[PDB]
Design a protein around this ligand. Sequence first.
Ligand SMILES: *C(=O)N1C[C@H](NOS(=O)(=O)O)CC[C@H]1C(N)=O
Length: 262
Amino acid sequence: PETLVKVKDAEDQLGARVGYIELDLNSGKILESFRPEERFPMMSTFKVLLCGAVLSRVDAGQEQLGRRIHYSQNDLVEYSPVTEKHLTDGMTVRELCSAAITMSDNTAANLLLTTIGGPKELTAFLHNMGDHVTRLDRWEPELNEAIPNDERDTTTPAAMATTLRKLLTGELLTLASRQQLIDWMEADKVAGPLLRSALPAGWFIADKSGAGERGSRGIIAALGPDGKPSRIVVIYTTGSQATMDERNRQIAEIGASLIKHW
Ligand SMILES: *C(=O)N1C[C@H](NOS(=O)(=O)O)CC[C@H]1C(N)=O
């Protein structure tokens, strides 16, 4: 009961809703949940779904990971630490997905949405792999607005957890594409103070973090002991006036509990 108590205590201390799934990667069955059917802004966590959609196109040969995209300084939106450094040489679709997931590059995310036909086509992709709940409507950075009770650019903990399992382990993507997606998430360099902060030596983690307006914060992860993922964790919160630091520490403490009671 310890981990669900942490989530409830986090709600108390953040003054906001927290959504939680712990999913068995093998069976795909929910082990624990909190507000599993409630909507939360995906924020940057959507970039894993976007690169899923890109890889599905690469498998079908409508995209090539080696294909180079040139863009202009005028295409650059807030938080573009990789893409602002490749204005003369451009970047391959592979490099863009690397930027989107490992660095949460916002311009990378928009360039990739253009490659698939935008938010409506990411939603179509999720619909057609059996996720009729998750929806993307807007581009970076507007999809992070987190307007209370707005369903635009939202998922549920349940839908995100099951969708992430299908992308990483389901029949949808080729083995090569599943390996490349989980590899990008393993190489995440912007989620240090979250689940990674509670991870013991020898454990595997592949994750993607997110932050938005109105105290929005979240993480999706495949993790497990002995260097192999065996569970999917989804944590979302929205509405809190809490600092980025407190929100990070609350997610870390939920992580510490689920690892403690593995
Ligand atoms: C993702 O939600 N975002 C991109 C960037 N990195 O934050 S993250 O590592 O939690 O992904 C900055 C904030 C945010 C955004 N508003 O786009």
